[PDB]
From Swiss-Prot, chain B:
One BP term from GO: positive regulation of interleukin-8 production
EC number: 3.6.5.2
UniProt modified residues of type (Microbial infection) O-(2-cholinephosphoryl)serine: 73
Name of the protein: Ras-related protein Rab-1A
Parent-protein residues present: 7 to 176 of 205
Length: 296, 170
């Protein structure tokens, strides 16, 4: 009878070292002499810890102003040039060129702890994979590599737990091989990023009093935005706690409302995991409020 | 306690319907809600044919480019791959080309293919004519079905067909 093996987790230790620990265990153990038990493995906590890492990473990119390092335009964000959506909604999101990259980052990578999957941020998925093609070596590529590995690890383990549950051994055995490889791969990628994160020499651009999510959007630019687009923006701003100056602008302006609303009624937002129904209602409220106030 | 075990694989662009297909077919349900599959997942339904009972180990894959490392692992093991495109999505069809290439690059020598045009119920928003698709399909002797995972339209028939097509080759 061969020793039982599992990959446990200390209560507060971070994703990075957690991986690193498992990385040792997996490297230094002749996996032939053990029988792997995935039951004690705490996906939920790992997911929690990972999303927490995604967040921290996102924060430093913004803070170190990594994105400015990474420009050649003044096009509203790194990916703007790569949108061919025609401001359509794509699985609940329209493309809005003003999104901060660090928001884009979080949304392509954080893991829905509920599903161990991704909540669609679709409008940027094409533009992003495009930018990647035309900018190997770019921080976004290096970062996304790293984060995808993150994602991978989680998925692998889920697949192991699941396969064990159904006795599918071919899978469980092979997936352990892979997991180890993802493990190292992750550790490399983690090292490799450290350069790409270095704060450029040009000074920190001055904070945006108006939104947590979008770069500034002047009234000219905002006006060219469509129903789905403004709609998309409203839903995003509701991820702040206090109402934003930006959403107030949008909701106060009488011209923007018809298209915002029809966007809503169109139903493209129905399937969002971010309580669309609730958000929509609240947006309607705030709009109703505002039109009362602007009746002077 | 089963007669056969076929390993199946759905590939295709992101959001073309792979997972709703797998879901309607396995659990006979559908959720409107927007989730993108990470890496892979697998569901297992047992089918009966001729009238041997066949266990289907169906593996769902992520469409995105960045998952390819992973998805590509599960290619060699598959008895049959279903490539899926979304009939209202032009590029998704244009992409079948690469998807077929990825099959050549990764899966077995003799893997059983199947082209599926999903979201067929969206009549007004459609853009890929059954004909044009079916011709391309026939160009390569790969069976082809339009389907709506939402409506159930042909989802059952699709996996049946893929399964039968496999037994024939065993
Ligand atoms: N009308 C219609 N919409 C669909 C159908 N299948 C998928 N969709 C929509 O497209 C989304 C993406 O499907 P999903 O299974 O996530 O695609 P995957 O990324 O290929 O697995 C779904 O959540 C639905 O909103 C279908 O058969 N008919
Ligand atoms: K557990
Ligand atoms: K960091
Ligand atoms: K709020
Ligand atoms: K927040
Ligand atoms: K729909
Ligand atoms: Mg999917």
């Amino acid at each position: 009878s061969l020793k039982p093996l599992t990959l446990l987790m200390t209560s507060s230790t971070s994703f990075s070292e957690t991986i690193n620990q498992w990385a040792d265990i997996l490297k230094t153990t002749d996996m032939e002499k053990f029988s792997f038990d995935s039951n004690p493995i705490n996906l939920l906590e790992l997911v929690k810890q990972f999303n927490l890492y995604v967040d921290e990473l996102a924060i430093t990119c913004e803070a170190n102003n990594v994105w400015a390092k990474e420009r050649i335009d003044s096009t509203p964000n790194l990916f703007a040039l790569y949108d061919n959506s025609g401001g359509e909604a794509i699985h609940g999101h329209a493309f809005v060129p003003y999104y901060k990259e660090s928001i884009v980052l979080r949304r392509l990578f954080t893991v829905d702890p509920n599903t161990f999957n991704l909540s669609r941020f679709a409008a940027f998925e094409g533009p992003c994979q495009l930018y990647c093609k035309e900018h190997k070596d770019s921080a976004w590529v290096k970062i996304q590599t790293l984060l995808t590995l993150g994602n991978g690890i989680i998925n692998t383990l889920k697949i192991i737990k699941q396969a064990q549950a159904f006795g599918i051994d071919e899978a469980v055995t092979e997936n352990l091989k892979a997991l180890k490889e993802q493990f190292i791969a992750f550790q490399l990628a983690e090292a490799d990023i450290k350069e790409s994160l270095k704060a450029p020499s040009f000074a920190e651009p001055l904070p945006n009093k108006e939104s947590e999510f979008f770069y500034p959007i002047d009234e000219k630019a905002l006006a060219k935005m469509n129903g789905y687009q403004l709609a998309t923006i409203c839903l995003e701003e509701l991820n702040s706690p206090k109402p934003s100056p930006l959403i107030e602008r949008i909701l106060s302006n009488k011209k923007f409302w018809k298209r915002i609303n029809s966007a809503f009624e169109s139903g493209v937002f129905k399937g969002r995991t971010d309580d669309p129904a609730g958000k929509i209602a609240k947006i309607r409220e705030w709009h109703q409020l505002l039109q009362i106030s602007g009746k002077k | 306690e089963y007669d056969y075990l076929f390993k199946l694989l759905l590939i295709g662009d992101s959001g073309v319907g792979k997972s709703c297909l797998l879901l309607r077919f396995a659990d006979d349900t559908y959720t409107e809600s927007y989730i993108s599959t990470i890496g892979v997942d697998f569901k297992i339904r047992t089918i009966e044919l001729d009238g041997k009972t066949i266990k289907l180990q169906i593996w769902d894959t992520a469409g995105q480019e960045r998952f390819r490392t992973i998805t590509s692992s599960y290619y060699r093991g598959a008895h049959g791959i279903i490539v899926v495109y979304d009939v209202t999505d032009q590029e998704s069809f244009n992409n079948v080309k690469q998807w077929l290439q990825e099959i050549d690059r990764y899966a077995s020598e003799n893997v059983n293919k199947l082209l599926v045009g999903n979201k067929c119920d969206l009549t007004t928003k459609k853009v890929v004519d059954y004909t044009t698709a079916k011709e391309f399909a026939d160009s390569l002797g790969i069976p082809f079905l339009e389907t709506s995972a939402k409506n159930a339209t042909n989802v059952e028939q699709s996996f049946m067909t893929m399964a039968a097509e496999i037994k024939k080759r065993m």
